[PDB]
Amino acid sequence: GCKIGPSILNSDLANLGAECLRMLDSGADYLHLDVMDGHFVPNITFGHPVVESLRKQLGQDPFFDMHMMVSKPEQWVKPMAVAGANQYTFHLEATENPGALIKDIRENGMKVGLAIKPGTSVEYLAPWANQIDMALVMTVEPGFGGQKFMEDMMPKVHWLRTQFPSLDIEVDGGVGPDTVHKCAEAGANMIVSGSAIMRSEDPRSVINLLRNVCSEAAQKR
Amino acid sequence: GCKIGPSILNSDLANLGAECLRMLDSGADYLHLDVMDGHFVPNITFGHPVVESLRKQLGQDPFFDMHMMVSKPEQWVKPMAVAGANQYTFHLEATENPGALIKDIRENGMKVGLAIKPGTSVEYLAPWANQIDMALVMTVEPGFGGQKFMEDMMPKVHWLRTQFPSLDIEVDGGVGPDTVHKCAEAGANMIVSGSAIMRSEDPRSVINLLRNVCSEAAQKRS
Ligand SMILES: [Fe+2]
Ligand SMILES: [Fe+2]
């Protein structure tokens, strides 16, 4: 049940279709698409219009995990659903009413992801864990780096894995061949990796490595 | 001095490089790139990371007019300059200190555009007209998709052209072959058009039509 989802912010964004296609051909399990509105985080990447074009090119099969680093996640639920997103991963910090938003995401036919930034206690996420499809533990601060993987996020992953053995747990931020062992041993089964994959001359090899480390750790649990 | 700048939001945004190459190969004079942050307008398009990749793909020559429909235009000046934007067109409504922002744009080596939404008096542009490279008169409300061209914006264009004969004036919003003459007769010399160019089998012909309607109307007034 371990899956690798390349992030594409490090890719040639003027040729996004080609970059996604070669990730899929390289054996990516899903694509992790970072949506930043310049308010929740200090960068603007792309929104649903790009997602819609991507979906049109890639067809119906590929799974899009939308990482919604936006200040008003309620606003983009329907646009992302219409664009063809599979999963809407919103930040717990970005809404006063996560329960209502979770309901809305499901009513719009999408899976539910719930993300926490490094400074947010995993204790805030736990109360909602049985309502979501996937928890995302950030391992860098979103919108800034360009940062080193934060090893002190691993206790969050471990706690979640301990308390919720069946929960899919994703990590995102500086994850690569060098740090995937930490994530996998802590309990993560969904791995987002950007530069490590996208800049590789052999992304299939990198993806296989990442998945194999996770799988090995899962079989040990 | 009449120029056509396709807007690219109705293009295949998964292949922005190819779509822009096609526009340039069709004789587009520049590219008009709509940046929306989901706050100043109720849509999110793309930001400087996309611009940086587009500049890399297209090379140094093409001109990018960045239509910054963003709440904090001060924030994206350096990122856009680093990304290789030629002109940073911000909304007058979006800053309380346009003078400082204009200065910051020039200090970062970019040309300065100043945009006004339909509800904003063209008079607000006047104090700044001597400091900017281009005025952008919106002819639809930005961020609400396909809207009808607002002919009642033409007096804004005509007023600007009358007050500032040497000022480049861009129109943007529902502009196509059906409405370009209205813009040109009012004084606009920079025309943004989207679907009418992007959807065509022969975008060169559409671009040429827009440009020549504009040029011949401009020649007439002269
Ligand atoms: Fe992400
Ligand atoms: Fe525009």
Q: How far is CA B160 from the centre of its chain?
A: 16
Nearest ligand to the C-alpha of residue B113?
2
CATH number at residue A140: 3.20.20.70
What is the spatial distance between Cα A88 and Cα A9, in angstroms, rounded to a whole number?
Answer: 18
- Which residue among B42, B46, B75 places its CB closest to the CB of A45? B46
What DSSP letter does each residue of B67-98 carry, written as one string? EEE-S-GGGGHHHHHHHT-SEEEEEGGG-S-H
What is the spatial distance between Cα A210 and Cα A6, in angstroms, rounded to a whole number?
Answer: 11
What DSSP letter does each residue of chain A carry, written as one string? --EEEEB-TTS-GGGHHHHHHHHHHTT-S-EEEEEEBSSSSS-B-B-HHHHHHHHHHH-SSSPEEEEEE-S-GGGGHHHHHHHT-SEEEEEGGG-S-HHHHHHHHHHTT-EEEEEE-TTS-GGGTGGGGGG-SEEEEESS-TTT-S----GGGHHHHHHHHHH-TT-EEEEESS-STTTHHHHHHHT--EEEESHHHHT-S-HHHHHHHHHHHHHHHHHH-
Q: Do B76 and A15 lie within an 8 Å CB cutoff?
A: no
CB neighbour list of residue A99: distance below 8 Å, 6 or more residues apart: A128, A131
Asked if residue A55 lies in contact with residue A84, where contact means CB atoms within 8 angstroms, the answer is yes
Ligand 2 centroid to Cα of residue B65, in Å, is: 9
Output b/e per residue, A152-183; b: 16+ Cβ within 10 A: ebbebbbbbbeebeebbbbbbbbbbeebbebb
Instruction: Collapse the DSSP code of B20 into the 3-class scheme (helix H, G, I; strand E, B; otherwise coil) and give the result.
Output: helix
Other beta carbons within 10 Å of A102: 19
Domain count, chain B: 1
Encoded tokens for B160: 């600007």
What is the spatial distance between Cα B33 and Cα B64, in angstroms, rounded to a whole number?
Answer: 7
What DSSP letter does each residue of A142-196 carry, written as one string? TTT-S----GGGHHHHHHHHHH-TT-EEEEESS-STTTHHHHHHHT--EEEESHH
Question: How many Cα neighbours within 13 Å face the side chain of A216?
Answer: 11
A12 flagged as catalytic: no
Asked if residue A148 lies in contact with residue A118, where contact means CB atoms within 8 angstroms, the answer is no
Beta strand A134-138 pairing with B111-116: unpaired
Owner of token pair 């930040």: A91
Residues spanned by the domain of A62: 1-221
Instruction: Collapse the DSSP code of B111 into the 3-class scheme (helix H, G, I; strand E, B; otherwise coil) and give the result.
Output: strand
Encoded tokens for A1: 């049940």
Owner of token pair 């899919």: A168
Residues of chain A positioned with their CB less than 8 A from the CB of B53: 11-15
Listed resolution, Å: 1.7
> Would you report the helix, strand and coil content of chain B in percent, each value rounded to 5?
45, 20, 35
